[PDB]
Amino acid sequence: MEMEKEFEQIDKSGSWAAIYQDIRHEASDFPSRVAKLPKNKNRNRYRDVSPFDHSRIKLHQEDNDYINASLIKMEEAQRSYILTQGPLPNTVGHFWEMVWEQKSRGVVMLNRVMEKGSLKCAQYWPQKEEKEMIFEDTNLKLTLISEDIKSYYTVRQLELENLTTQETREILHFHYTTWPDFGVPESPASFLNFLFKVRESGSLSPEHGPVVVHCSAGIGRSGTFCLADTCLLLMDKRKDPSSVDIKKVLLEMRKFRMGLIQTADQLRFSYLAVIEGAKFIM
Ligand SMILES: CC(=O)N1C[C@H](Oc2ccccn2)[C@H]2C[C@@H]1CC[C@H]2O
Question: Which of 249, 265, 272, 278 has the fewest CB atoms below 10 angstroms from its CB?
Fold first, then answer.
């Protein structure tokens, strides 16, 4: 069955809610014992969103190695992603420590700092060249180098300095700024254009550490980004592009972080994204 006819039949049938609940029912359940330790309560944004112990990113410190972040490793596609929550006021230094230690080239942000009149993550990068940020708890300095503001996204060049060794690296910040406060975008054209801007940068390539991807919880919009990227890469690698099963790829990804794709509308949008992508990709 051709992906876009399961979708046209799910649409003809309006069964999106039924498909989505079948995924929720078959998803992996692994322990998250480190996330639930009392010493870590102020390191979690949402009580119901935690990294599994087996796939969690460890900070390189003896004090407390915990961050709300997971390694998604896709064996057949040969892609890895780190999915994390939007940083909290007390975890902005941990966030940049992780980017440093994992050798990431890119950070992908899919939310605004304020949405629906409430704060969805800390202001964790500098807004002016001449006002740099210092994270005293992790010994890092972060400077804004340049900013390119477009209609659907902004790309920033940042300089991260390890103050312990005086090594520096260039980090690219890819900020999708137009996801609506409610629901999903009507067309996937701008999100797809955005995905191909991150690829073109080198940030997803095996010469670097994994890309860091976040939204507010790091499971819904973040899940949509990695699911569309991996499905399109599998369609380019395999003999029969029609063999790629988006529901099976999503369940593989849910072995590494809980809750990826938060709504039936995010599942339909993911299908739409890979359909138009593949209409021009095979
Ligand atoms: C319809 C559309 O605009 N798309 C954008 C994108 O194509 C590229 C490739 C390289 C550089 C820029 N855009 C994606 C998804 C979809 C179709 C083909 C697929 O590669």
Answer: 265
Contacts of 230 (CB under 8 A, 6+ apart): 74, 77, 79, 249, 253
Cα separation of 10 and 271, whole Å? 11
Our mutation pick for probing the ligand 1 site, out of 193, 230, 236, 244, counting the most ligand atoms within 8 A of Cβ, is 193
The technique by which this structure was obtained is X-ray
Q: Which residues have C-beta within 8 Å of that of residue 115, sequence separation ≥ 6? A: 181, 216
Question: Which of 195, 196, 197, 279 to mutate to test ligand 1, by most ligand atoms within 8 A of the CB atom?
Answer: 196
Write down the residue that tokens 């399109």 correspond to. Answer: 232
Q: Dihedral of the CA atoms 225, 228, 231, 237 (nearest 10)?
A: -80
Q: Which residues line ligand 1 (CB under 6 A)?
A: 189, 192-193, 196, 276-277, 280-281
DSSP string, 87-106: PPTTTHHHHHHHHHHHTBSE
State yes or no: is 121 an active-site residue.
no
Cα separation, 68 vs 75, whole angstroms: 23
User: Distance, CA 104 to ligand 1 centroid (Å)?
Assistant: 24
Determine if residue 189 is labeled as part of a ligand binding site.
no
Topology (CATH) of 1-282: Protein-Tyrosine Phosphatase; Chain A (3.90.190)
Tracing tokens 């051709």 back to the chain, one arrives at 2
28-32's contacts with Cβ under 8 Å and 24+ in sequence apart are 28/251, 28/254, 28/255, 28/258, 30/54, 30/55, 30/255, 32/258
Ligand 1 atom having least distance to the Cα of 277? 15
Resolution (A): 1.7
Contact 214, 257 (CB under 8 A): no
